[PDB]
C-alpha cells in the first residue's frame, strides 16, 4: 500500500532526502518533549 | 585490627632502568649492606 | 478583522452554529451571508459540502470565495461508504481505482490552493491518495 522503508529509495534521487528531513524533524519533535520555557 | 602486615613479592622485582638510576650492576649483587637508622622507633609497633 | 475557514454543506446555510458563534463574533451579518452563500451553493445539486473562505473586513461587511468541496466527501462518495474507518489503516472502509482519484483530482484542480499551483494531475492524484490513506479507503490500480 503506502511507502514506508527509506532504504528502498535511491540516495541519488531527489525524493529520498525528503524522508530524511522528515525523520530529522521527528527527532527534534521528540527532543522537545522535555524542553519547557 | 592493626597488624603485622606484609609485602607482595612483585615489589622487590627490579626494573632494568633502576640499575641505571641507583647505580647497581645488573649482573652482580653487591656483597655488604651499610644500614643506618634514619627515623625513630617510637610510635611504631614493638615488633 | 480576519479570515474564516468554514466547511458548509450544499443547500444548508442556517442562522445558528457554526455560523452564529464564528461569523457573529466578528460583528458580521448572518443573514446576508446566508443569502449570498446559499445563492451560490444552491446551484450545486451534487450535494457537496465545500470549504469556503470568508474574508471579514474592518467595517463589518464581508466577502466570499468558494473553493472545491472536501476530499473527505469526494472519497466518502467514491467508496460508497458513510463514515470512514474507526482505526484507519488497521481496518478497511471502502475502495477506489486509478480512475476515482483521477476524477476527484481534475475536479479539485481549480481549488483556491491548487490553482496557483501548476502541478500536473499526477501531483494532485498523489495528494488525493494521501487524503485517502488516512480516511481508511484503499487504492487499487487497474
Amino acid at each position: 500500500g503506502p511507502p514506508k522503508k527509506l532504504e528502498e529509495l535511491d540516495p541519488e534521487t531527489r525524493e529520498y532526502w525528503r524522508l530524511l528531513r522528515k525523520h530529522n524533524i521527528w527527532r527534534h519533535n521528540r527532543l522537545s518533549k522535555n524542553r519547557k520555557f | 585490627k592493626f597488624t603485622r602486615s606484609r609485602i607482595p613479592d612483585k615489589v622487590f622485582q627490579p626494573s632494568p632502568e633502576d640499575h641505571e638510576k641507583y647505580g647497581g650492576d645488573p649482573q652482580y649483587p653487591h656483597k655488604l649492606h651499610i644500614v643506618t637508622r634514619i627515623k625513630s622507633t617510637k610510635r611504631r609497633p614493638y615488633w | 478583522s480576519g479570515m474564516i475557514r468554514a466547511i458548509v454543506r450544499a443547500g444548508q446555510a442556517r442562522p445558528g452554529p457554526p455560523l452564529g458563534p464564528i461569523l457573529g463574533q466578528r460583528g458580521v451579518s448572518i443573514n446576508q451571508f446566508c443569502k449570498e452563500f446559499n445563492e451560490k451553493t444552491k446551484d450545486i445539486k451534487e450535494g457537496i459540502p465545500l470549504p469556503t473562505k470568508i474574508f471579514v473586513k474592518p467595517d463589518r461587511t464581508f466577502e466570499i470565495k468558494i473553493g472545491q468541496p472536501t476530499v473527505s466527501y469526494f472519497l466518502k462518495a467514491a467508496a460508497g461508504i458513510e463514515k470512514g474507518a474507526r482505526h484507519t489503516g488497521k481496518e478497511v472502509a471502502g475502495l477506489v481505482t486509478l480512475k476515482h482519484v483521477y476524477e476527484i483530482a481534475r475536479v479539485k484542480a481549480q481549488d483556491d490552493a491548487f490553482a496557483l499551483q501548476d502541478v500536473p494531475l499526477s501531483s494532485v492524484v498523489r495528494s488525493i491518495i494521501g487524503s485517502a490513506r488516512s480516511l481508511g479507503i484503499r487504492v487499487v490500480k487497474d
Partner: protein
Amino acid sequence: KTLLPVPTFEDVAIPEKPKLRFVERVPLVPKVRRERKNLSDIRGPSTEATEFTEGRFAILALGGGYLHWGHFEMMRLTINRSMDPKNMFALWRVPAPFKPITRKGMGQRMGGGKGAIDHYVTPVKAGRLIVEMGGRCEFKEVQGFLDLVAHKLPFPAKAVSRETLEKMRKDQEERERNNQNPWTFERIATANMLGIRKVLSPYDLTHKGRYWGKFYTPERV
C-alpha cells in the same frame, strides 16, 4: 546546510507492563530477629549489578547509600508519569527493602536492649544501577527527566547509557596510565611505605583510597 542519517530502532522489543512494579512497604515474612547493621554493606565498590541487562539506560549510584520505601515511591511515580508506555519500559535493578532498622522511642536512657523495627531498607553500594530503562528513545529525553530522579536520591547519582558509562570507565583507567606523579596510593599501600599501614584500614588495599566511608571520589585516579 547538512543532513545526517537518523538512528532507527528496528530492534526495539517493547515488553508488556513497561512501567515500574509496585514495591512493598514491608516484606511478606517480616524479619522477627533484629539484625546487626553492617555498615560495611554500603562500604566500597559494588560487586553485583555493575552492568546492564536489557536496556540502554540507567540511574547509576556514585556514592553508597540506603534506599527506603519513600524513595521507591518517588521513583515509581516520577518515572511512570514521565515516560511514554509505548516507546519505553523500565526495570528494577534493586530488590525491595529487606533490611531492618531499629528504633527506641524518645526519652530513652542508653542501653536496656535493642529497640523495635521501624524501617525496611535496601543498601546500595557505589557503582550500582538502581533503575534500568530500555526503549526506542534517544538518551537525551530519558536523561532529562531521570536526572530529576537521580538528584532526589540519598546518595549522589547519575543518568547513563552504555556509551556514556563505557566512556567514563575507559577514561578512568586512561587517567591512571597517564599519571605523571610516580606515587600512587596502591603503590604505597601494598608496599607499606612510610609504615602507612598504621594509619590505613585493611579495606584500603582494595579501595586504593578511592572509597572513603560510604563516599566515592571518581577524581581519585
